[PDB]
């Protein structure tokens, strides 16, 4: 696990090696009330939802807190309002966020598309999927990462979003974000801002009215074999447990 430093094992969670020696500094990271924290499972292919949030907050570019670059020292001195990305589980986030400070948006995605995206990000797909099912990837069990943010979705500084809802209902979503983030609009400004989010999304879309590539919903169906999928579903039901979280696996 930590053999040859491949991973850094922290309180039962396998983290990338670059997380070693800074979990105390992140726990203590001073959060500003005007910060916007975007959390995603790694390589989950939600960039487009990220662009929409960025666009909303104003009615390679975004730093990751725990990454080698730009580093925590640069992130401390960034001018407000800061847009800060992380892949850490809720529990490993700055302790200020656990007390209700600032605003954390978690972007979930159904786990079948997410494994394809992760695998296609730039190894058989099948070993990768197996490593995913056996909780072997950096940042830990996906089932744990998602269920912890779902459990906190009613918290006042937490908005749990699902990637697929951005395609089924962008309108609800954009306003949900506007209100969460205290971006105050009259009617017309909300209609306009929504139409900008729409145009920005639609510009990646094809005849499915869905993005082409890793951000496509139902992508997994073209990749998973029948047995792979039967093995997945079985793991998924077993690891999800009593959790009442559901996804759209296609649109």
Residue numbers in the entry: 13 to 71, 84 to 146, 156 to 284
Task: Reproduce passages from the article.
Cytosolic sulfotransferases (SULTs) comprise a family of enzymes that catalyze the transfer of a sulfonate group from 3′-phosphoadenosine 5′-phosphosulfate (PAPS) to an acceptor group of the substrate. In doing so, SULTs modulate the activities of a large array of small endogenous and foreign chemicals, including drugs, toxic compounds, steroid hormones, and neurotransmitters. As expected, all SULTs share the same basic fold: a central four-stranded parallel β-sheet surrounded by α-helices and three loops that are often disordered (dashed lines) in the absence of PAP and/or substrate. The crystal structures of SULT1C3 bound to PAP, apo SULT1C2, a ternary complex of SULT1C2 bound to PAP, and the environmental toxin, pentachlorophenol (PCP), and SULT4A1 were solved at 3.2, 2.0, 1.8, and 2.2 Å, respectively.
SULT4A1 is one of the hSULTs that is most divergent in sequence, and examination of the binding pocket revealed two significant differences that are predicted to affect PAP binding. First, a Trp in α3 that is conserved in all other hSULTs and stacks with the adenine ring of PAPS (Trp53 in SULT1A1) is replaced with a Leu in SULT4A1. Second, the magenta PAP binding loop is much shorter in SULT4A1 than in the other hSULTs, and lacks the conserved Lys residue that separates the key PAPS binding residues Arg258 and Gly260 (SULT1A1 numbering), which results in these residues being out of register. Taken together, SULT4A1 has a slightly smaller PAPS binding pocket that is predicted to be unable to accommodate the cofactor. Interestingly, some residual electron density was observed in the PAP binding pocket of recombinant SULT4A1. Presumably this derives from a bound small molecule that was co-crystallized, although we were not able to identify it either by modelling atoms into the electron density or using mass spectrometry. However, PAP when added at concentrations as high as 90 mM did not stabilize SULT4A1. Significantly, this protein, which is expressed primarily in the brain, binds to 2-hydroxylestradiol, thyroid hormone, T4 (3,3′,5,5′-tetraiodo-L-thyronine), and the catecholamines norepinephrine, epinephrine, and isoprenaline (but not dopamine), suggesting that SULT4A1 may modulate the bioactivity of these compounds via a mechanism distinct from sulfonation. SULT4A1 is inactive as an enzyme in our experiments, likely due to its inability to bind PAPS or other sulfonate donors. This orphan SULT likely has an important function in the brain, nevertheless, because it is highly conserved and binds well to the neurotransmitters epinephrine and norepinephrine.
